Design an enzyme around this catalytic site. Structure first.
Site, PDB file in Angstrom:
ATOM      1  N   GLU A  98      -5.420  -6.892  -4.227  1.00 45.77           N
ATOM      2  CA  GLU A  98      -5.507  -7.967  -5.214  1.00 45.77           C
ATOM      3  C   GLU A  98      -3.655  -7.567  -5.148  1.00 45.77           C
ATOM      4  O   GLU A  98      -2.511  -9.183  -5.489  1.00 45.77           O
ATOM      5  CB  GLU A  98      -5.344  -8.295  -6.014  1.00 45.77           C
ATOM      6  CG  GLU A  98      -5.847  -6.923  -7.412  1.00 45.77           C
ATOM      7  CD  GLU A  98      -5.885  -7.380  -9.044  1.00 45.77           C
ATOM      8  OE1 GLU A  98      -6.695  -6.419  -9.123  1.00 45.77           O
ATOM      9  OE2 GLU A  98      -6.437  -8.284  -9.264  1.00 45.77           O
ATOM     10  N   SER A 116       1.132  -1.447  -0.205  1.00 40.37           N
ATOM     11  CA  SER A 116      -0.387  -0.214  -0.350  1.00 40.37           C
ATOM     12  C   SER A 116       0.537   1.431  -0.095  1.00 40.37           C
ATOM     13  O   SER A 116       0.031   2.351   0.279  1.00 40.37           O
ATOM     14  CB  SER A 116      -1.114  -0.221   1.208  1.00 40.37           C
ATOM     15  OG  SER A 116      -1.853  -1.084   1.060  1.00 40.37           O
TER      16      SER A 116
END
EC number: 3.5.2.6
Length: 267
Positions: free
Chosen positions: A145, A46
């Site tokens: 994903e 992230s």
């Protein structure tokens, strides 16, 4: 000297936890740098969201988007880990707040909504990084994903150096004008998820702006930050790590320590 020792220390650190550490630090006041596996690819996880926030600020700068425009998604099924977007799901949020939520809270709904509506998806996000001279960065998939962190997979990866250099251009460089750059810097300073990583490797008097990444697989976690020391020029630090087994958990302590060493290598 101080560099070869630092690299020895990093090598030992990756042996100890049986993983891989990628480091890149820049002393912006001198141009001195330190790298370890700096050209090797590591999953972004992230952490790419810190660049997503910048891309949005660029669209805002070019006046293609308004930072105060309302973004509604009341009928949208929010992805896992959308602490901010789920609380404002009924009223919507401004583009600015959503972008900072994506960065400061690693909000997945914010991230995917912004990528589908404003940035052109993973291809667009990657196109933005190319626009600032980053040819290593690549985002192929969407949240969540992109977090698979499968060893040897080059999808959704970058190198510690490319991340360090791009963060430098964006947070301290001239890609964003003084006003928009000031907003970006403060969004980074406001990150709420990196207290145990780079922020823990510096004295409390230093200001840190960062964006973490935790894939939740293969012990893959990372952190990049702009450090504003007291009485000194900004430092840029990029730490990326992966582990050998899928079930391995990431190590914040190894990241904070790698951070400590890197900062000493460019002192």
């Amino acid at each position: 000297n101080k560099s070869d020792a630092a690299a020895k220390q990093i090598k030992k650190l990756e042996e100890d936890f049986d993983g891989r550490i990628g480091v890149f630090a820049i002393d912006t006041g001198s141009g001195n740098t330190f790298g370890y596996r700096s050209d090797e690819r590591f999953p972004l996880c992230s952490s790419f969201k810190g660049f997503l926030a910048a891309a949005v600020l660029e669209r805002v700068q070019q006046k293609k988007l308004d930072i105060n425009q309302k973004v509604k998604y009341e009928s949208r099924d929010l992805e896992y880990h959308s602490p901010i977007t789920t609380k404002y799901k009924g009223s919507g949020m401004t583009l600015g707040d959503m972008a900072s939520a994506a960065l400061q809270y690693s909000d997945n709904g914010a991230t995917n909504i912004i990528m589908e509506r404003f940035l052109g998806g993973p291809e667009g996000m990657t196109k933005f990084m190319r626009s600032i001279g980053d040819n290593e960065f690549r985002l192929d998939r969407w949240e969540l994903e992109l977090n698979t962190a499968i060893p040897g997979d080059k999808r959704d990866t970058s190198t510690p150096k490319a991340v360090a250099n791009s963060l430098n251009k964006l947070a301290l460089g001239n890609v964003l004008n003084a006003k928009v750059k000031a907003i970006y810097q403060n969004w980074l300073k406001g990150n709420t998820t990196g207290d145990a990583r780079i922020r823990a490797s510096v004295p409390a008097d230093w200001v840190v702006g960062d964006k973490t990444g935790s894939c939740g697989a293969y012990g893959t976690a990372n952190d990049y930050a702009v450090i504003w020391p007291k009485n000194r020029a900004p430092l840029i630090v990029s730490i990326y790590t992966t582990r050998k087994s899928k079930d391995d958990k990431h190590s914040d302590k190894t990241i904070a320590e790698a951070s400590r060493i890197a900062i000493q290598a460019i002192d």
